[PDB]
Amino acid sequence: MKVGIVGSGMVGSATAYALALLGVAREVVLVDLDRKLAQAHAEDILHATPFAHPVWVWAGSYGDLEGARAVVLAAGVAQRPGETRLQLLDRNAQVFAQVVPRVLEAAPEAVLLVATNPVDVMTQVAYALSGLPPGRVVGSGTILDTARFRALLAEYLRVAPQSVHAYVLGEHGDSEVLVWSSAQVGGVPLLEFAEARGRALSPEDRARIDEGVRRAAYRIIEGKGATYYGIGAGLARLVRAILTDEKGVYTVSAFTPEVAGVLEVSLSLPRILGAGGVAGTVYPSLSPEERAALRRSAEILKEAAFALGF
Amino acid sequence: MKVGIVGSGMVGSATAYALALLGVAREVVLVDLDRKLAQAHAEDILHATPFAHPVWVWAGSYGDLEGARAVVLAAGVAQRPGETRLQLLDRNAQVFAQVVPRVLEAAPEAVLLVATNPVDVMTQVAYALSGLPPGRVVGSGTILDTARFRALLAEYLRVAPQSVHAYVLGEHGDSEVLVWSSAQVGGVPLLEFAEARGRALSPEDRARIDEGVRRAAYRIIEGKGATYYGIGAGLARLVRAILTDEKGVYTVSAFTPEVAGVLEVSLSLPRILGAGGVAGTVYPSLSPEERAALRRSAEILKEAAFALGF
Amino acid sequence: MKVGIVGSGMVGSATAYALALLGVAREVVLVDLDRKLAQAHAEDILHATPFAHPVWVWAGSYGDLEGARAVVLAAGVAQRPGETRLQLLDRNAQVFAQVVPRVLEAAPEAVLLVATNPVDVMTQVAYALSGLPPGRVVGSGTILDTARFRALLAEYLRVAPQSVHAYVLGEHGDSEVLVWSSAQVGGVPLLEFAEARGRALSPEDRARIDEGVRRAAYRIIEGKGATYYGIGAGLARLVRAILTDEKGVYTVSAFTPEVAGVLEVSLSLPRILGAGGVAGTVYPSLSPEERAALRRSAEILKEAAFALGF
Amino acid sequence: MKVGIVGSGMVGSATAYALALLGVAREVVLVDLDRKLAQAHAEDILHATPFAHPVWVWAGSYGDLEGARAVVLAAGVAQRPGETRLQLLDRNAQVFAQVVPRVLEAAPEAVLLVATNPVDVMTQVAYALSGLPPGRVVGSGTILDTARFRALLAEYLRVAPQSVHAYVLGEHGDSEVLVWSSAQVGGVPLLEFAEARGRALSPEDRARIDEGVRRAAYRIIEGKGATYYGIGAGLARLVRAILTDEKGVYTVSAFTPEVAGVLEVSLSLPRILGAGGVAGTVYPSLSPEERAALRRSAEILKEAAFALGF
């Protein structure tokens, strides 16, 4: 079935591309302020379809979003020199104040998947503006970082990543929490199963993995100036979760009534994703340190929200 | 790359078919005492390939197994009226005494995947006859039962099966142990996460699921007289593990030095499967009851082995 | 979406398996006179699903076919040795007289895919009994044979089978016509492009290929006593055509108002397959010999029909 | 199963992405002058892998290309506005004079897949600098254009694109030739099968389709400023042809001893692609007009070559 993407820039277009190569959705509609850009991306992708899957990819207006199961909000403004993360945040909040109602007008049944950075806050803004139930608005959140964590662990232990269950929670960004505490492999505690293999996870190792997960976006942005590909494919996977009513577990950003003592904040927790959006929350055990860090992350997300008027 | 299958009957042929439809291997070689049968299965499957994948499926002799990474041993005798499980076991043991050296002569260079029932014992016999390291001989074991467990649980909790970690261990058969103890969903304890939805599992629920897992084979055999399809696809997935050096976790039957107090027995535990066969064992927490049941299962498998002279 | 299968024997069950491993349809319903058989096949396949795709496979009754896009008719009687092809044919015609209305009662919108041999005649019987438009009733026909032809040619010329366009037409059976005349590779005449490579197709080559195609079914039946796997996957591919509204070209059996001079007969011609069944016919150039042979095939199919009262 | 990509920009990175999402290769090496760029693209894509396939994607130097079956040459300089197509071409030719010997030093076994525009000429330059046999150097050529032709025809006819054989030949660019003449559907002449469905192609429809093909790249570049996605996936499909020794037919650019009267020129013709590169050419029937247009295209490609010194 059908998926909308509003915001046709690098992230939007990469998401479309991934949807198309993976054969997730039958239909993909690109909507962008610059009409010509969306059309160009659409046609470029359309060129690729014959080498993967019969996906109808096209550019249109908000109205064309009718019936989309999900709409990804990838929109946002040109970064501007000598402008505080705050001013940018403001201009984007304004973009979303345009976009959300219009998307909802056409496709009142859709789930909104929020892309645009910073993702937790934008997720808050969209939840606020949508007047939908909280679970209908999902931010992409920490999924890439969680996946990378699982990957580095997998690689350390010489085990399939699929057998590694570990989480990254909180703000997607520097304050994100890697939960080492309750992490497991094959359903047994990580660090135990570390001895149980020949591989005791020195704090130095812990630190090496942390750098690996934490600084990946920074490096990507330093070398190429933006991230698209990873998130494009993550968004694709979430869109697939939504369309197949998978009810699978992903660490995503949503409005949470209370987390670690903080009230009414959007951030990433493991959540059950399916056709109506998120349908349930999974609480892994946190150590006191991790809980404290989560609490901090949430606090700071919450003050951001407040500073912006959300 | 290349996979051998010895014994061409319903299980062997179904395994080949699954290999072929899933596109696991490049090449599948069927070897059977009845040459015409293997050739007929081969060509039937060959007919199917154009509707899935370019897989070369053909019938040959043991020598044709050269270079196969894995060889599935599906061989075994016609069951015969009012013959004890013992006499059958005996005749099969002798089949394997033929087959094993012949397979290893041609493909000294292979992992043996044991199909033939009863699977744990047959796995013991093959381990014994091979003189290979224990991990090069793997029985299909409890995988179907573990997967169905995961499935029934998944279905109870309204959650994707992928997010359910639960095990079935021991003898593949009536003994088998369902480990409810350490079972989890999304990396958190099952029963906890039961109340953590709309969930609490009543003992009659646990019993309904237990019937579901455990007596499945019996029902299948009562209706159609044999099981092939499930194990065909299970075998396929293990073969894929082996060929891709996946190092993933499966509950499979192998020779284990000690389990739950019993010495030198073959049975199903979660094991790490990869290119050289099993490469490590994962020990989930067992409750005292579960541990006792496991101990029992092992004991009985071990006496079977002994009775047969293994 | 949803597919029905009526008759649960080797062909039915294999088709179900294939549908499931290939992830064609979300739902597969097995309906068989012997309820226990259908249920056992269903559960055996269900065991396989976790190793491929989330397909819901279950056994039920005709009423449970509601909403299926396609229903495969695989039913039919136990053979009896020394019983003429005619009496068998009769026995089956009566089976279909039982099945067809019942299938159309529950799922009046469905396309009927006719498996049961001899397939052309059964296809006629089903067309007659259905009172549907002709294109709603499609026999599996010559597809396996056409694919095999393409394959052997592909292998002769050292070229991908995808590039080879060649047909097998008429009765599925001995009298089938291999069209060598208009056969091409990469859109250019076969025999020409034969000199255009290093291989000029001697008549004994032609003959070798002919043997390869026409007698395959015979060999399979001599070795294993029945064919299932190939047609299982073919049926699967046709089902996928119908459910995706592929409008792709397959040589299938359907009621044809006139072919090569013969009137109102069912046989295999290249036809465009899609959501409403066949939607158009493609006429390849035939040589006078080929046309004659086709005419013969049709004549004999038609007299068969008449002898049976169709 | 390893693939190199030299030059890291939009086309290179998109090709890597596509390789990775489609699960073509086990390993993808990015090599770019700007080391940081390659690394960033690599890591961004790596982030995506967990949502599709276990592909190892990394950035390294030419030496790291050892053992690659194919290496895509995507490199090429920044376009300066004002600058004639000739100066650009000169700058690119020098880039290739650096790159080719380096790639062949590390991976003397590989097959060069030429990306960089203008593709036919760059393909010539690479062939010349390689000193390899002609079929070892393959340009991406007209593939996207051929596929869109087939697509628009398929759409007109309401038939699956897979059943449409039609070609685009010559210079990838404005002077490319659509062969309407020998085009067929289901192995029968297009225009005939046009009346054979209801609705023949009118000079107006032929023109509508022509615009659709020939001008696509222009529109894409006017809207987004570059094309990547389509060719990324095309390149991917070609790489898959090479690695699976597919021997399939693609219209690609290679050095051709003679075409339509012109001598020693590189351009797109249907060619048989496999593990050693191209392995044979397929000559479709051309009408005199088509013939003439091809000869023109070739002439102009050849003068381009000469002007540059090739």
Ligand SMILES: Nc1ncnc2c1ncn2[C@@H]1O[C@H](COP(=O)(O)OP(=O)(O)O)[C@@H](O)[C@H]1O
């Ligand atoms: N009000 C709006 N409605 C729709 N699209 C918008 C609006 N404002 C900005 N956009 C689009 O959002 C896109 C952002 O793309 P880009 O700057 O690459 O950021 P990202 O990398 O997050 O996609 C731009 O292409 C712009 O056209």
Ligand SMILES: Nc1ncnc2c1ncn2[C@@H]1O[C@H](COP(=O)(O)OP(=O)(O)O)[C@@H](O)[C@H]1O
């Ligand atoms: N000594 C042997 N060597 C090779 N193949 C054998 C030998 N003994 C039996 N077989 C084959 O093993 C197959 C047994 O499979 P079958 O009894 O049909 O169902 P299952 O797959 O459950 O065993 C038979 O088809 C037979 O041809």
